[PDB]
Design an enzyme around this catalytic site. Structure first.
Site, PDB file in Angstrom:
ATOM      1  N   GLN A  23       0.869  -1.204   0.000  1.00 31.21           N
ATOM      2  CA  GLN A  23       0.000   0.000   0.000  1.00 31.21           C
ATOM      3  C   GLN A  23       0.894   1.238   0.000  1.00 31.21           C
ATOM      4  O   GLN A  23       1.955   1.211   0.624  1.00 31.21           O
ATOM      5  CB  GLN A  23      -0.983  -0.007   1.175  1.00 31.21           C
ATOM      6  N   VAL A  24       0.483   2.271  -0.727  1.00 36.03           N
ATOM      7  CA  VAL A  24       1.163   3.592  -0.757  1.00 36.03           C
ATOM      8  C   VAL A  24       0.182   4.617  -0.171  1.00 36.03           C
ATOM      9  O   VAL A  24      -1.032   4.541  -0.482  1.00 36.03           O
ATOM     10  CB  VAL A  24       1.637   3.937  -2.182  1.00 36.03           C
ATOM     11  N   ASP A 145       9.743  -3.457 -15.689  1.00 36.14           N
ATOM     12  CA  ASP A 145       8.267  -3.265 -15.567  1.00 36.14           C
ATOM     13  C   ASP A 145       7.867  -1.913 -16.174  1.00 36.14           C
ATOM     14  O   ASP A 145       6.956  -1.273 -15.644  1.00 36.14           O
ATOM     15  CB  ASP A 145       7.828  -3.385 -14.103  1.00 36.14           C
ATOM     16  N   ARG A 149       1.271   2.446 -16.469  1.00 35.27           N
ATOM     17  CA  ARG A 149       0.697   2.456 -15.095  1.00 35.27           C
ATOM     18  C   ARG A 149       1.837   2.687 -14.099  1.00 35.27           C
ATOM     19  O   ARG A 149       1.539   3.073 -12.951  1.00 35.27           O
ATOM     20  CB  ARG A 149      -0.150   1.205 -14.828  1.00 35.27           C
ATOM     21  N   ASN A 150       3.096   2.533 -14.535  1.00 37.51           N
ATOM     22  CA  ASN A 150       4.294   2.666 -13.664  1.00 37.51           C
ATOM     23  C   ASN A 150       5.067   3.933 -14.001  1.00 37.51           C
ATOM     24  O   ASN A 150       6.288   3.995 -13.683  1.00 37.51           O
ATOM     25  CB  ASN A 150       5.230   1.474 -13.805  1.00 37.51           C
ATOM     26  N   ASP A 163       7.831   2.578  -9.627  1.00 38.87           N
ATOM     27  CA  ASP A 163       7.723   1.139  -9.257  1.00 38.87           C
ATOM     28  C   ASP A 163       9.006   0.378  -9.618  1.00 38.87           C
ATOM     29  O   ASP A 163       8.977  -0.465 -10.546  1.00 38.87           O
ATOM     30  CB  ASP A 163       6.460   0.483  -9.821  1.00 38.87           C
TER      31      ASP A 163
HETATM   32  O1  LIG Z   1       6.880   0.839  -5.384  1.00 38.61           O
HETATM   33  C1  LIG Z   1       6.220   1.894  -5.487  1.00 38.61           C
HETATM   34  C2  LIG Z   1       6.806   3.135  -5.243  1.00 38.61           C
HETATM   35  C3  LIG Z   1       6.054   4.305  -5.358  1.00 38.61           C
HETATM   36  C4  LIG Z   1       4.704   4.269  -5.688  1.00 38.61           C
HETATM   37  C5  LIG Z   1       3.875   5.518  -5.809  1.00 38.61           C
HETATM   38  C6  LIG Z   1       2.510   5.409  -6.139  1.00 38.61           C
HETATM   39  C7  LIG Z   1       1.703   6.528  -6.266  1.00 38.61           C
HETATM   40  C8  LIG Z   1       2.242   7.797  -6.064  1.00 38.61           C
HETATM   41  C9  LIG Z   1       1.662   9.077  -6.137  1.00 38.61           C
HETATM   42  C10 LIG Z   1       0.345   9.483  -6.443  1.00 38.61           C
HETATM   43  C11 LIG Z   1       0.077  10.844  -6.392  1.00 38.61           C
HETATM   44  C12 LIG Z   1      -1.191  11.310  -6.675  1.00 38.61           C
HETATM   45  C13 LIG Z   1      -2.221  10.449  -7.000  1.00 38.61           C
HETATM   46  N1  LIG Z   1      -3.489  10.972  -7.265  1.00 38.61           N
HETATM   47  C14 LIG Z   1      -4.185  10.648  -8.488  1.00 38.61           C
HETATM   48  C15 LIG Z   1      -5.059  11.869  -8.796  1.00 38.61           C
HETATM   49  N2  LIG Z   1      -6.062  12.169  -7.732  1.00 38.61           N
HETATM   50  C16 LIG Z   1      -5.611  11.747  -6.387  1.00 38.61           C
HETATM   51  C17 LIG Z   1      -4.092  11.863  -6.273  1.00 38.61           C
HETATM   52  C18 LIG Z   1      -1.976   9.090  -7.034  1.00 38.61           C
HETATM   53  C19 LIG Z   1      -0.706   8.616  -6.770  1.00 38.61           C
HETATM   54  N3  LIG Z   1       2.650   9.950  -5.855  1.00 38.61           N
HETATM   55  N4  LIG Z   1       3.827   9.227  -5.634  1.00 38.61           N
HETATM   56  C20 LIG Z   1       3.600   7.919  -5.740  1.00 38.61           C
HETATM   57  C21 LIG Z   1       4.416   6.798  -5.616  1.00 38.61           C
HETATM   58  C22 LIG Z   1       4.136   3.011  -5.942  1.00 38.61           C
HETATM   59  C23 LIG Z   1       4.874   1.830  -5.840  1.00 38.61           C
END
Ligand SMILES: Oc1ccc(-c2ccc3c(-c4ccc(N5CC[NH2+]CC5)cc4)n[nH]c3c2)cc1
Length: 281
Positions: A23-24, A145, A149-150, A163
């Site tokens: 989970q993030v 990967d 989506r990444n 990711d």
């Molecule tokens: O191994 C991983 C390392 C980092 C992340 C990760 C995932 C999502 C984010 C995000 C992120 C920021 C904004 C969003 N939004 C989408 C738009 N509306 C709500 C906010 C979603 C994800 N910022 N930094 C991240 C790092 C995932 C897996």
């Protein structure tokens, strides 16, 4: 269990965990920025779920260690800190307010396909990502990967490779295991990765071609209508995706060159960078 590394260590009392984005979660990290040590910086925190496996923990530790060794770049999500001691493993990274490239592109689609983007915007997006992969390759890093989506997009529309869960050192692919490359999404994988249990920078070039097709179709799903079960066969028969809608012949040729059967005849990221700069200028 986890050794000390105080260059990266970050106090747990100054991290306030917010809503979800393993989970993030969105977090506020007070004094994470060196040059503003009182202000609450918005970051992303990756941690284990309650139903986590031993593999989930070594994956997360592997990911953290990867992001320390790769260093700093404009077009990769950068490691900001980590809570390794005296409680749950927290891996702290840059917040990118506009989320993943797939949803970013799909949300900006013109009407009737089921802020809009210019050809140049899509070429610029691809070019940012080619620069990110030129850096990663130069740091001896294979991502394994690459997909829309990444990729995460910052507030200022900067493209960030994300990711690093599956990322390895070039010299750390096991030719002598059946399970090698078993956890890579098959629709993004170079055939040599699928079959021969190898992975080079030229495997990532193939993936980057798939990412390009995702970019130019405005977040379309690769091999539409083709089940992953049938893809293996269609590829060795030499099937390749057809040209995206408003995409020039030139950028389609680029995708096709990334999908050469022979890894060493595919272009390097350095060559994709050179070529994409000439098209963007
Ligand atoms: O191994 C991983 C390392 C980092 C992340 C990760 C995932 C999502 C984010 C995000 C992120 C920021 C904004 C969003 N939004 C989408 C738009 N509306 C709500 C906010 C979603 C994800 N910022 N930094 C991240 C790092 C995932 C897996």
């Amino acid at each position: 269990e986890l050794p000390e590394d105080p260059k990266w260590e970050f106090p747990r009392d100054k991290l306030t965990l917010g809503k979800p984005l393993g989970q993030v979660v969105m977090a506020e990290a007070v004094g994470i920025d060196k040059d503003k040590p009182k202000e609450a910086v918005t970051v992303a925190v990756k941690m284990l779920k309650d139903d986590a496996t031993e593999k989930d923990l070594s994956d997360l530790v592997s990911e953290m260690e990867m992001m320390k060794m790769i260093g700093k770049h404009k077009n990769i999500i950068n490691l900001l800190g980590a809570c390794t001691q005296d409680g749950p493993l927290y891996v702290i990274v840059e917040y990118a307010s506009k989320g993943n490239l797939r949803e970013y592109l799909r949300a900006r689609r013109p009407p009737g396909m089921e802020e809009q983007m210019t050809f140049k915007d899509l070429v610029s997006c691809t070019y940012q990502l080619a620069r990110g992969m030129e850096y990663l390759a130069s740091q001896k890093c294979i991502h394994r990967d690459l997909a829309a989506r990444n990729v995460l997009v910052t507030e200022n529309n900067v493209m960030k490779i994300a990711d690093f869960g599956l990322a390895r050192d070039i010299n750390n692919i096991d030719y002598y295991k059946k399970t090698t490359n078993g956890r890579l999404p098959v629709k993004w994988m170079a055939p040599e990765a699928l079959f021969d249990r190898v992975y080079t920078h030229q495997s990532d070039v193939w993936s980057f071609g798939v990412l390009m097709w995702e970019i130019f179709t405005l977040g379309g799903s690769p091999y539409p209508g083709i089940p992953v079960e049938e893809l293996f066969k269609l590829l060795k028969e030499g099937h390749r995706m057809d040209k995206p809608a408003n995409c020039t012949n030139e950028l389609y040729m680029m995708m096709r060159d990334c999908w050469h059967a022979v890894p060493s005849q595919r272009p390097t990221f350095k060559q994709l960078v050179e070529d994409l700069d000439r098209i963007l200028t």
